[PDB]
Write a protein that binds this ligand. Structure first.
Ligand code: TTP
Ligand code: MG
Ligand code: NA
Ligand code: NA
Ligand code: NA
Length: 323
DNA sequence: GCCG
DNA sequence: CAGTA
DNA sequence: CGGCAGTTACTG
């Protein structure tokens, strides 16, 4: 509900690509609140009443109804669409997009022929369209299975779980998030080397984006893969290997959504605790600015439910975390 | 941008 | 580190 | 005034 959002969503992306992350966050929250309410908004007071919507935002919602158009939109820089185009290249963010624009680049052809690309950005440009597409969850299953098969091939005890949007039950997935760990709490160490080389053997992996294979403590692998046969597109792969003791927090984190994690972490903070993909801690010592000064104590969290419990929150199935 |  | 994830 | 997730994990 509420298509007075699609117009704010435009301003949100504009601010975001331009690097004004906080203002963009504000819009994201407001847009989210509107899309989450039960009835069409038709009153200034009805807008301010909504948490996440202030005078400024409501003031704009008023015009969206009293005018049917937002004057602010007719003043967005012409650079925005190009910044969005550029920042949609994997490995390039607002800073790079703005730099390229300042240098006169206006299209991907300009980037391809004149820009100095990092290894990651070159891969992103090579798969520009594929990286903007989502795959049916069915294909995500095959990819997760492909990774699990290669993993359990050298250690049948390894536990592999597809997380992210997949575990949240979404019909399509941006990429495939696979969490790998081992019940014995030690057999997870230094497996990337073997797993990745195995996946490379069968020609499954096509490009590596983030993979510190010289570090025996590598925690993640971000890359590209493709299943065999016709009609197959290059798909993004995200693999993390975590120690069993961090299984719950890691599973919770990797399942998301990102907004859900942020909300949960923000809550933990208001309660003198801290939550991360590594652990839930209590008695955390923070400064006047909120930065974690003291480590506090790690709380035992053998399951996701324990995390919710310790935070005094009712448990939520992955599908109920799709924020 | 919103909010404490 | 800044940038991007 | 000043936080808005994580003292998150790589890259160069
Ligand atoms: C991007 C991002 C992800 N995460 C966590 C929660 C996400 O579910 C998980 C994996 O990230 P993503 O794969 O980016 O998210 P997603 O799988 O939910 O959505 P998509 O289908 O587009 O891939 O990592 C964060 O905590 N913060 C972030 O900023
Ligand atoms: Mg994903
Ligand atoms: Na990008
Ligand atoms: Na590498
Ligand atoms: Na991912």
């Amino acid at each position: 509900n509420l298509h007075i959002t699609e117009k704010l969503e435009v301003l949100a992306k504009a601010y975001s690509v331009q690097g004004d992350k906080w203002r963009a966050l504000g819009y994201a929250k407001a847009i989210n609140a509107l899309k989450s309410f039960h009835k069409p908004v038709t009153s200034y007071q009805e807008a301010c009443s909504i948490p996440g919507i202030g005078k400024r935002m409501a003031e704009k919602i008023i015009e969206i109804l009293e005018s049917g158009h937002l004057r602010k939109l007719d003043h967005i820089s012409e650079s925005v669409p190009v910044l969005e185009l550029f920042s949609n290249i994997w490995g390039a963010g607002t800073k790079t997009a703005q730099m390229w624009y300042q240098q006169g680049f206006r299209s991907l052809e300009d980037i391809r022929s004149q820009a100095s690309l990092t290894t990651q950005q070159a891969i992103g440009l090579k798969h520009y369209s594929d990286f903007l597409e989502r795959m049916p969850r069915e294909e995500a299953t095959e990819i997760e299975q492909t990774v699990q098969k290669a993993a359990q091939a050298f250690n049948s005890g390894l536990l592999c779980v597809a997380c992210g949007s997949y575990r949240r039950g979404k019909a399509t997935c941006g990429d495939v998030d696979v969490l790998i760990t081992h019940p014995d709490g030690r057999s997870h160490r230094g497996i990337f080397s073997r797993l990745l080389d195995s996946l490379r053997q069968e020609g499954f992996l096509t490009d590596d984006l983030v993979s510190q294979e010289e570090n025996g403590q590598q925690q993640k692998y971000l890359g590209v893969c493709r299943l065999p046969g016709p009609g197959r597109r290059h798909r993004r792969l995200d693999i993390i290997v975590v120690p069993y003791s961090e299984f719950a927090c890691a599973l919770l984190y990797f399942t998301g959504s990102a907004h859900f994690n942020r909300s949960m972490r923000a809550l933990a903070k208001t309660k003198g605790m801290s939550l991360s993909e590594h652990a839930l801690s209590t008695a955390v010592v923070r400064n006047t600015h909120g930065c974690k000064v003291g480590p506090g104590r790690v709380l035992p969290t053998p399951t996701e439910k324990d995390v919710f419990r310790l935070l005094g929150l009712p448990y939520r199935e992955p599908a109920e975390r799709d924020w």
